[PDB]
Amino acid sequence: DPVDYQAEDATIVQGAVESNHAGYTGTGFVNYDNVAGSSVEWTVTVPSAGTYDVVVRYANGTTTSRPLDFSVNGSISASGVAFGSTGTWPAWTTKTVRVTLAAGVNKIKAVATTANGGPNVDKITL
Ligand SMILES: O=C(O)C1=C[C@H](O)[C@@H](O)[C@@H](O[C@@H]2[C@H](O)[C@@H](O)[C@H](O)O[C@@H]2C(=O)O)O1
Ligand SMILES: [Ca+2]
Ligand SMILES: [Ca+2]
């Protein structure tokens, strides 16, 4: 079965664990710093090699899409994945990103590519 990997439990670069908007799961969420290069990197375990539907649960209380690049350590997995508006910060939704993984432990990194940083990210599920 898919497992929830909480953002606030992952490796956060230029970001903060926060909990001041309603509707996150786990103990909070990650607010990426509003800077290019802000990132979160999750450590996941999957039973078989192949391409997974990585469900990214996020919010973006602005009218400006906030794109992320996904990689599995070192290697580009998805490039310029746009995270559009959700109207308000507590209004979480999801986006599925295809990421190819090996059997066992993998690290998935999502890095902000624009000066606005990333959307707020609650977790990934896969
Ligand atoms: O990414 C944002 O633009 C953002 C994340 C927060 O969830 C929002 O409440 C809002 O926060 C602003 C700053 O990003 C944040 O670092 C500061 O501590 O508070 C700001 C605010 O407007 O409250 O935007
Ligand atoms: Ca931010
Ligand atoms: Ca969370």
UniProtKB/Swiss-Prot annotation:
CBM6 domain residues: 3-126
The record's subcellular locations are:
Secreted
The family note in this entry says: Belongs to the glycosyl hydrolase 2 family.
User: What's this chain's function?
Assistant: Hydrolyzes chitosan and chitooligosaccharides with retention of anomeric configuration. Has maximum activity on chitotetraose, chitopentaose and their corresponding alcohols, with a slight decrease in the rate of hydrolysis on longer chains. Has no activity against beta-D-glucopyranoside, beta-D-xylopyranoside, beta-D-mannoside, beta-D-glucuronide, beta-D-galactoside, beta-D-N-acetylgalactosamide, beta-D-N-acetylglucosaminide and alpha-D-N-acetylglucosaminide.
Assembly and partners are described as: Monomer.
The name this protein carries in UniProt is: Exo-beta-D-glucosaminidase
What is the primary gene name for this protein?
A: csxA
What range of the intact protein is shown? 907 to 1032 of 1032
